[PDB]
Design brief:
part of a larger assembly; 2 chains; about 0% strand; virus; HK97-fold; T=9; tailed bacteriophage; Major capsid protein, gp6
């Protein structure tokens, strides 16, 4: 009967592309971001501990 | 007037002229890269003042 008055509909929402879960940026250290607001190298120094004497 | 007998006849006037040509058109045009703007030690607005000083 209704060849002309039953609509086809489009969802107003796009279906997201899946990709993969990202994890590594939460798992590594982020503390050097603050100093790194400028420049192109961060220099990171570590302590050589003083030795224990008898 | 004395060499002319005592005759006088009217000359046509005329003008001279020079053209001011407004023919110089000069420009400054440069990029400030966003990576550079972020990575340098301070403000790059000294390059806008350098461009104005050059014109």
């Amino acid at each position: 009967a209704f060849n002309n008055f039953i609509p086809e509909l489009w969802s107003d929402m796009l279906l997201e592309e899946w990709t993969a879960q990202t994890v590594f940026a939460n798992l590594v250290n982020r503390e050097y971001e603050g100093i790194a607001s400028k420049g192109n190298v961060v220099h990171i120094a570590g302590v050589v501990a003083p030795t224990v004497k008898d | 007037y004395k060499a002319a007998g005592r005759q006088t006849s009217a000359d046509a006037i005329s003008d001279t002229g020079v053209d001011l040509l407004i023919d110089q058109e000069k420009s400054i045009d440069f990029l400030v890269d966003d990576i550079d703007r972020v990575q340098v030690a301070g403000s790059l607005e000294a390059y806008t003042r350098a461009g104005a000083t050059a014109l």
